From a paper:
This degradation pathway requires the cofactor NUB1, yet the underlying mechanisms remain unknown. Here, we determined a previously unknown mechanism for substrate delivery to the hs26S proteasome, in which NUB1 functions as an ATP-independent chaperone to trap FAT10 in a partially unfolded state, recruits it to the 19S regulatory particle through Rpn1 binding and presents the FAT10 unstructured N terminus for engagement by the ATPase motor. To determine the structural details of NUB1-mediated FAT10 delivery, we solved the cryo-EM structures of the ATP-hydrolyzing hs26S proteasome either 30 s or 60 s after incubation with the preformed NUB1–FAT10–Eos complex.
Similar to the deubiquitinase Usp14, whose UBL domain binds the T2 site in a slightly varied position, the NUB1 UBL domain uses a hydrophobic center (M154 and L156) that is flanked by charged residues to interact with Rpn1. NUB1 uses its UBL domain to interact with the Rpn1 T2 site, similar to the deubiquitinase Usp14, yet it lacks additional persisting contacts to further stabilize the NUB1–FAT10 complex.
Residue numbers in the entry:
A (entry chain f): 155 to 172, 182 to 355, 367 to 620, 645 to 908
B (entry chain B): 43 to 84
C (entry chain U): 828 to 838
D (entry chain g): 79 to 173
E (entry chain A): 39 to 66
């Protein structure tokens, strides 16, 4: 009897927590495999904690269902069951020679040795090519050995040196090579100062990002570059490197003209542009380390400001020893201002994000200790914990000692640093206990309440792991905005932007539009920038209409108008071909570099009045670290483009129900060089080709199906 | 529909550990919401 | 009031 | 071998050539000489390109040995829109 | 259906908590 054995398995699971039991489970599990009730068998081993021998009893016809069920349960179970579940599912995948999806789980585990072992064990060169594509998208690089066959192509794929050419191939394919002037975004003719020039420079950088062509800077841009004034003249030059993103040869050619300027602002903006150009792509000759290294100890603080941030963006998520050893002494330098120390913290955190680097942590802690309380009152000091927090991004319980080291620090900076590092350690984990602690922090009303904004941001930074926590945190953010103190509610728009970046869902956009025209100027700026961030790179027509209406409303307010222009530039990022979402591979893999960049921008937005609206708007270029293309290329065995027919539609959960359910709904058929919106999956419409990886995102390699045309 | 009380759609429909975990996450966030609101109202 | 007992801390 | 260092030169992709090229040379030759050599053998203008060598910048005035170059080091070639001497001039005019 | 009683209890708790949230926050 099926019901009797189900009840027996339930009773066995109940009494295990309280010899023949092993025989009972070893007989029940194959039955559930036979009668297609895989998830009940998975629950059995999950309860009695013997998921080890579940692998031995898996057949070819059911590995996908058990793997998907085990992986989907990880986001909602705490440690140490996360590691056990990931390793069991990875072992099941490896036993079945499904190398790409095993590498996905290894990247989830953040086990570098396991990733290298999976990459090396596979014998299929094409499968290794696809896995190198996933590694390059994730920002993970393996130092392969020379005896490995096809070393050059594998390293080139992992280093993303071909990303720029493929992106330009898309742009030519979608005939969107034409540059867009910021006036095309503003559409001021339909409407019935240095700040606006800086806003237009930022829009010009955002819209034409990674395209390499521009009607306003690739021409004789000295007129436009000098049209800005003072520190805005900093960012415009840096924007010139944003158009040439991922193009470390052409971009550095177009930036070198500005490296000879007698003006410090243009020179350091161009240094930051050189750093931006090298972001993502991993060149072997290290051009960014060659150009920006000589200006990290310059007399001018602007020289250092551009150079350190450029080097951090270029080598973000790399954990390079040479760059870190070159950047660490900048913190303790006497001539380094608190701005330079904060930007050094940001760069060092971005370079060694999620690596728990000992030198970075020790140097940041020493810098924090040496600063006096009056110095710690400076808001740029807030970047020091962030670089520390980025050092331990997603590590979890590895910050306790660091927390102890932070106990001696004086308040209120001690509370701010503690909250920031505690949040960063549990980023993308969904730990409801940590979110409960953050809500406890946000509960107490109060200078004194600086860390409350960080706690509000951290609620989103933890709940971003999966959709259930995301929507629940949306409700929590509504409550915080209703009941919070003004310092509490100035960060809620930033949390909304973080939790739904490049995902312009209607409810969040409406919530931000309600608070866009708010009495408090800071929450208004944050709400407008969050409207820009939420629909960043989506080319949302409705969001563009709201932003144009806001520009009409905020015409007389320079700060609000600047924020509106920034949001408009973000909405049309990369002409709709780029995304800032830190989650890829069906929103299951968290890119530490993207999270680092988003944090660098959003935490700095907690002082939008003095940082973003002041002389430090260049920190917006941290979004470059999070700039990835919403990609779908099908390549042949020799990496040449292969136009194929695919069906693109909103992703549908498959776990649970049996059969072969449709994974997409409301789909349409397009040729493969197409852009995927957030939450949109793509599947091969025909059976002519077999993808190397199940996930049809980024660069995908297709093989000829022998069964087709039998 | 019911506006504020739109809860996320839990999957799968079949009763299993995964659905229990998703529903418990929803319950945890609702409990945290209740605590926060009861603290802020007073 | 009293710390709400979440599912995780129930152990 | 025999004072021969094969620099691993990385050319720009706009010149559709081999991505990685070996170039053997002696070590006490000056940076200007090295720049001229990579200009001539790979067909580029001597004064219109910049060499990034050993993760640093090529010091034209100084010889290769004092820059710390060695065997199998990598050198990336960057093309220039304006030459290194007239760019400063026209930017000084653009003041 | 070993979690049927647990799922039912959690769903009832969810509904009670949602009703309490609506009562405290107003929305009527």
């Amino acid at each position: 009897g099926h019901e009797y054995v189900r009840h027996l398995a339930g009773e066995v699971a109940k009494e295990w927590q309280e010899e023949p039991l092993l025989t009972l489970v070893k007989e029940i599990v194959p039955y559930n495999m036979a009668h297609n009730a895989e998830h009940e068998a998975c629950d059995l081993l999950m309860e009695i904690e013997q998921v080890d021998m579940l692998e031995k009893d898996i057949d070819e016809n059911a590995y996908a269902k058990v793997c998907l069920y085990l992986t989907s349960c990880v986001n909602y179970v705490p440690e140490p069951e996360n590691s056990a579940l990931l390793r069991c599912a990875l072992g099941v995948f490896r036993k079945f020679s499904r190398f790409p999806e095993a590498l996905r789980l290894a990247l989830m585990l953040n086990d570098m040795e396991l990733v290298e072992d999976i990459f090396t064990s596979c014998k299929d060169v094409v499968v290794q090519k696809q896995m190198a594509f996933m590694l390059g998208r994730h920002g993970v690089f393996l130092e392969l050995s020379e005896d490995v066959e096809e070393y050059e192509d594998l390293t080139e794929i992992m280093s993303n040196v071909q990303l720029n050419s493929n992106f330009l191939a898309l742009a030519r394919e979608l005939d969107i090579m034409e540059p867009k002037v910021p006036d095309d975004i503003y559409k001021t003719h339909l409407e019935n100062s240095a700040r606006m020039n800086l806003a237009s420079s930022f829009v010009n950088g955002f819209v034409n990002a990674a395209f390499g062509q521009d009607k306003l800077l690739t021409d004789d841009g000295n007129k436009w570059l000098y049209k800005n004034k003072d520190h805005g003249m900093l960012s415009a030059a840096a924007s010139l490197g944003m158009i040439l993103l991922w193009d470390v040869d052409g971009g550095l050619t177009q930036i070198d003209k500005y490296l000879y300027s007698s003006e410090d602002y243009i020179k350091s903006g161009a240094l930051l542009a050189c750093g931006i150009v090298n972001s993502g792509v991993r060149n072997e000759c290290d051009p960014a380390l060659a150009l920006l290294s000589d200006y990290v100890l310059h007399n001018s603080n602007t020289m250092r400001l551009g150079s350190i941030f450029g080097l951090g963006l270029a080598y973000a998520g790399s954990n390079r020893e040479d760059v870190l050893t070159l950047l660490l002494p900048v913190m303790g330098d006497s001539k380094s201002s608190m701005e330079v120390a904060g930007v050094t913290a940001l760069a060092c955190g971005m370079i060694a994000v999620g690596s728990c680097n000992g030198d970075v942590t020790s140097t940041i802690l020493q810098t924090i200790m040496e600063k006096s309380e009056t110095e710690l009152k400076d808001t740029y000091a807030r970047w020091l914990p962030l670089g520390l927090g980025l050092n331990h991004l997603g590590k979890g319980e590895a910050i306790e000692a660091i927390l102890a080291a932070l106990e001696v620090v004086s308040e209120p900076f001690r509370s701010f640093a503690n909250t920031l590092v505690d949040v960063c350690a549990y980023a993308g984990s969904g730990n409801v206990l940590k979110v409960q602690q953050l809500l406890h922090i946000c509960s107490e009303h109060f200078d004194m309440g600086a860390h409350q904004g960080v706690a509000v941001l951290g609620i989103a930074l933890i709940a971003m792991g999966e959709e259930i926590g995301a929507e629940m945190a949306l409700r929590t953010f509504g409550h915080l905005l209703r009941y919070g103190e003004p310092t509490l509610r100035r960060a809620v728009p930033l949390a909304l932007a973080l939790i739904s970046v490049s995902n312009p869902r209607l409810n969040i956009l409406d919530t931000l539009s309600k608070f866009s025209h708010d009495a408090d100027p800071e929450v208004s700026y944050n709400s407008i920038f969050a409207m820009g961030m939420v629909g960043s790179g989506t080319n949302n027509a409705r969001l563009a209409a709201m932003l144009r209406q806001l520009a009409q409303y905020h015409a007389k307010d320079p700060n609000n108008l600047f924020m509106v222009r920034l949001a408009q530039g973000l909405t049309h990022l990369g002409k709709g071909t780029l995304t800032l979402c830190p989650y890829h591979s069906d929103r299951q893999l968290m890119s530490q570099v993207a999270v680092a960049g988003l944090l660098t921008v959003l935490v700095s937005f907690l002082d939008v009045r003095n940082i973003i609206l002041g002389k430090s708007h260049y920190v917006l270029y941290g979004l470059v670290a999070a700039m990835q293309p919403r990609m779908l290329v099908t390549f042949d065995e020799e990496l040449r483009p292969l136009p194929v027919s695919v069906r693109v539609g909103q992703a549908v959960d498959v776990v649970g129900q049996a059969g072969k359910p449709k994974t997409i709904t409301g789909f349409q058929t397009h040729t493969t060089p197409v852009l995927l919106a957030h939450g949109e999956r793509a599947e091969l419409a025909t059976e002519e080709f077999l993808p190397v990886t199940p996930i049809l995102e980024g660069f995908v390699i297709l093989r000829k199906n022998p069964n087709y045309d039998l | 529909p019911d506006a504020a009380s739109k809860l996320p759609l839990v999957t799968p429909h079949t009763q299993c550990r995964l659905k229990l975990l998703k529903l418990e996450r929803i319950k945890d966030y609702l409990l945290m919401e209740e605590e926060f609101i009861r603290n802020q109202e007073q | 009031v009293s710390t709400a007992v979440l599912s995780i801390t129930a152990k | 071998t025999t004072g021969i260092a094969t620099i691993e030169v990385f050319l720009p992709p706009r010149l559709k050539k081999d991505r990685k090229n070996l170039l053997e040379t002696r070590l006490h030759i000056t940076g200007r000489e090295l720049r001229s050599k990579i200009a001539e053998t790979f067909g580029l203008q001597e004064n219109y390109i910049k060499i990034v060598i050993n993760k640093k910048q090529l010091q034209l005035g100084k010889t290769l040995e004092e820059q710390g170059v060695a065997h199998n080091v990598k050198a990336m070639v960057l093309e220039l829109k304006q030459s290194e001497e007239d760019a400063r001039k026209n930017f000084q005019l653009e003041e | 259906s070993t979690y049927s009683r647990q799922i039912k209890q959690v769903e009832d708790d969810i509904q009670q908590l949602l009703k309490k949230i609506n009562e405290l926050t107003g929305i009527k």
